[PDB]
Amino acid sequence: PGIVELPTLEELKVEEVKVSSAVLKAAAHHYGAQCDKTNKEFMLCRWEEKDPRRCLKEGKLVNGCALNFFRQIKSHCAEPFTEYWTCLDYSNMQLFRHCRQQQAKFDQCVLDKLGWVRPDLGQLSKVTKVKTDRPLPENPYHSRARPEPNPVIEGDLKPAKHGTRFFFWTV
């Protein structure tokens, strides 16, 4: 009962990042602000509409932004960024404790050559509105009308009539 719509393999075929989790986890912080408008708008689309098949045009933009970001990081300050992830991936859980004095160096290089500044503590776990241009829908669940409540009975509450109406037990 009812067909389902779907996109096609031959479309939605963008050239992914294909980069590793260590590198992503290392570069994230800056990518938290750089390329943030797009990602926030995409998460908003995905949370408003539960239709991944409608929230796609906001994914290719995301990946394009991330790639134009890693591109600047490849042009400038590459080796600090390579030694960094090679220092991280050594550990098991990839923590930011065993690489401190291999981090501020990369940070200062990225800064002295670019107007980025590593976010502070507790700067991404904060709701930030996002100004968009598309609208908000209603009935996102594609729900149906709510069957009408029971018509209520009302009127001044006066006493019984002739008694309890029980067998000759008038009162």
Ligand X SMILES: CCCCCCCCCCCCCCCCCC(=O)OC[C@H](COP(=O)([O-])OCC(O)COP(=O)([O-])OC[C@@H](COC(=O)CCCCCCCCCCCCCCCCC)OC(=O)CCCCCCCCCCCCCCCCC)OC(=O)CCCCCCCCCCCCCCCCC
Question: Which residues of this protein are in contact with other proteins, per CB under 8 A?
Answer: 16, 18, 141, 143-144, 146-147, 149-161, 164, 166, 169, 171
How distant, in Å, are the alpha carbons of 44, 45, 47, 49, 55 from that of 136? 10, 9, 11, 9, 13
**Least CB distance from residue 148 to other proteins, whole Å?**
8
Nearer to other proteins, 128 or 164 (CB): 164
171 binds ligand X (CB under 6 A): yes
**Least CB distance from residue 169 to other proteins, whole Å?**
5
- DSSP secondary structure letter of residue 10: T
Say which entry of other proteins, ligand X, none residue 168 contacts (CB below 5 to 8 A, set by partner kind): ligand X
164 binds ligand X (CB under 6 A): no
d(CA 46, CA 130): 14
Spatial CB neighbours of 16, under 8 Å, sequence gap ≥ 6 = 63
Spatial CB neighbours of 168, under 8 Å, sequence gap ≥ 6 = none
Nearer to other proteins, 101 or 150 (CB): 150
Say which entry of other proteins, ligand X, none residue 121 contacts (CB below 5 to 8 A, set by partner kind): none
Nearer to ligand X, 139 or 170 (CB): 170
Burial class (CB in 10 A: 0-12, 13-18, 19+), 144: exposed
160 binds ligand X (CB under 6 A): no
Say which entry of other proteins, ligand X, none residue 155 contacts (CB below 5 to 8 A, set by partner kind): other proteins
169 binds ligand X (CB under 6 A): yes
H helix intervals, 21-157: 21-33, 36-48, 57-75, 79-88, 104-113
Q: Which stretches of the chain bind ligand X, using CB under 6 A?
A: 168-171
